[PDB]
């Protein structure tokens, strides 16, 4: 059962943030050059308060959160975000991470209801 | 190429309405052979009867410093400045 529950963006500086291991090969004591999809240094990153709009995916996303209450549980990734296409749903619960890809008919404003 | 890749990191923080400075590399978490297109996304929140940040990746050349223990500890974003 679906339930029906825009603000100007805030921005922050990503000083040296979002670097990841480009591959799974072990290296040590070396400076290695790589070309990949990375978050540019000191870029302008959009800041939201958990305000949960649908965002463009572009070429990939760096995501971060600061919390002490486990409010952010997961994400929806897709194209049409309706039964017309396959969509990727990633959610976390108290024991497991659950990942599914289906022709999901998503709610207009999806969330997990906690009692 | 049809593969949905996730990298991640988890630390404590004592700062407030902003991201911390300093270097930290994100490790591979999962690689899923899904084979679908993604153009839009949304966050899923738990609501009872916190803040997040979104940045976008670009094709950039980096110089990565691997320490004696094989962990990346520093990096240069080659397209940032001269």
């Amino acid at each position, epitope marked *: 059962q679906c339930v029906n529950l*825009q*603000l*100007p*963006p805030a921005y922050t500086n990503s000083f040296t943030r979002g670097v990841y291991y480009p591959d799974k090969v072990f290296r040590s004591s070396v400076l290695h050059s790589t070309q990949d999809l990375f978050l540019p240094f000191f870029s*302008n990153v*959009t800041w939201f308060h958990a305000d949960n*709009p*649908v*965002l*463009p*995916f*572009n*070429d990939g996303v760096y995501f971060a959160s600061i919390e002490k209450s486990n409010i952010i549980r997961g994400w929806i990734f897709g*194209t*049409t*975000l*309706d039964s*017309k296409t396959q969509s990727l749903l990633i959610v976390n619960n108290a024991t497991n991470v659950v990942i599914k890809v289906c022709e999901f008919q998503f709610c207009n404003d999806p969330f997990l209801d906690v009692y | 190429d049809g593969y949905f890749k996730i990298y991640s990191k988890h630390t404590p923080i004592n700062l407030v309405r902003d991201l911390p400075q300093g270097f930290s590399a994100l490790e591979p978490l999962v690689d899923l052979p899904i084979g679908i*297109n993604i*153009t*839009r996304f949304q966050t899923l929140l738990a609501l009872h009867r916190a803040a997040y940040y*979104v940045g*976008y990746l*670009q094709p950039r050349t980096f110089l990565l410093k691997y320490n004696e223990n094989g962990t990346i500890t520093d990096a240069v974003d080659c397209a940032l400045d001269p």
Partner: antibody
Amino acid sequence: EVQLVESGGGVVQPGGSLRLSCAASGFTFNSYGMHWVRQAPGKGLEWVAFIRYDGGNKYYADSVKGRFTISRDNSKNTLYLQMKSLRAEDTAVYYCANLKDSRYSGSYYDYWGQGTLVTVS
Amino acid sequence: VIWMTQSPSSLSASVGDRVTITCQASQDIRFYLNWYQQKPGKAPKLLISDASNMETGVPSRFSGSGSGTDFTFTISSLQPEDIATYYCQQYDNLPFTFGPGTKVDFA
């Protein structure tokens, strides 16, 4: 809150050139790809060009391809269209817009500016 | 290039009448089609995306359906505020293309 404001319009001669711009506010300009669309007096809409969020890949209609250039500045939240070798047929109101698209731009919201008139005479 | 066309070029209808506008793509564009409404002196406003998905804030009297090359836009009960030109646009393949537009008059 969301605003798109075109400027740089006016009257030019055939074979000349003109630089149009569109200032953006109220939305994450640097997150979206942007389109240009034009409408001649008494006519329907014509799609002109598209640029990706990173200012990389660019696309043009055959009517402007090879003559017009699309660019952006994500630090100034501004979209630009540089037109060269203008013709009488290019007389139109030019609009900047974020067109809803589930394939290329990934835009969920649809926004348009007020438009700027360009006349070639 | 995928060309777009519309039929009729114009129609006349009264308040309470059902209005149907046909849009056709030169090639199969799945369900990827935007419907825009424009009044004189103003920028176009989106009413429908992905063929059938209604935009938030759009009155329930508006609808649309179709697939491939064949799309239809409907107003189930025309209001005096609905006198406008309607355009259909395909976003399946770049360059993107708009149809000629269908003009609705008040009879």
